[PDB]
Amino acid sequence: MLQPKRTKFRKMHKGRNRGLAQGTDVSFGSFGLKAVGRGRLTARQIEAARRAMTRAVKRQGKIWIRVFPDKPITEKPLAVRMGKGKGNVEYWVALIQPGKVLYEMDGVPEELAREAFKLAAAKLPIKTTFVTKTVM
Amino acid sequence: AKLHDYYKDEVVKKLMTEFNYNSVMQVPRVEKITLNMGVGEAIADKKLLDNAAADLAAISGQKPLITKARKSVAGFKIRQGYPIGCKVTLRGERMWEFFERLITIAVPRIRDFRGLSAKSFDGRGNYSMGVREQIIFPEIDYDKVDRVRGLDITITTTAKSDEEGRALLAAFDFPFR
């Protein structure tokens, strides 16, 4: 599980998730798993999907996780009233918008990249698509 | 002024001959000679730094400037602005007189003298050496020493490269093993 090594403040406000994404082209690799839905992704979903990919295209290839969590999500325990402070940091999410290339892959044929990205897009909560490295 | 005159004829002429300078002023000249004695054991004793100051007062012909600590560091048990060394900036006539006594009578009185290292340039020609005894200067009375106190000399010159400082200093014959 991914999590920043050392923050600056422990608890972040909710804020909103509007507009489109910045990481949009397949930059590092050759094939990409790009988001279409909005959503947000916990570190467990990123790890689950990465294991599905790494298993699927065996220890050949090279995989880039282009998103990183760095946003702490706090929850209140059970049978605790409202108020009395902000909750506790339970997990860490990345906020996703439509357009984020969530993962990249290189060093495989396209048909294995289809296969691993299908296998791993079923571990994520957002609708997802397959993209290739377009040249300009 | 003996080595200053010797400079003004034969070292200027000699270095204009060796290196193919155009300007007569492009030649290296020695700017200053700083004598530091960074005592450091004066964290507990003040008369020890006073005796150090008397020794640099004897070796050069000037009062030294008792230097203070720039930062506080705990590795050596000091504090900000605590007096920890003393130095004399010799320049002008006294630079040449001290340089004459140094290369003439002080350097040969070094114990087990093999020569001064030629790789003691800081890249910009400026020599720096260290003596381990203050006894090697003929002024320091051998019967009046209490602590052995070396010091470090630094010849600062206007040469750009350090081979150019090899040339400048070596034209005073300045031993160079």
Binding site: - | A57, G61, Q62, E97, I103, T104, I105, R109, F113, P138
Partner: protein, 52 residues
């Protein structure tokens, strides 16, 4: 230089066993007897016996 805070720096005459009579300014305040000078010190013979 300032006034009298500096030690008295008067010209003296040093003389070693090499016959090198050499007058210099030094704040000893006394004439000087030496053995080794820059002239006739075993520096080059010293390096030779070192390597040899």
């Amino acid at each position: 230089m300032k006034k009298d805070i500096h030690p008295k720096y008067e010209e003296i005459t040093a003389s070693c066993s090499c016959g090198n009579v050499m007058k210099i300014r030094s704040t000893v305040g006394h004439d000087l007897n030496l053995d080794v000078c820059s002239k006739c010190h075993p520096f080059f013979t010293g390096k030779q016996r070192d390597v040899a």
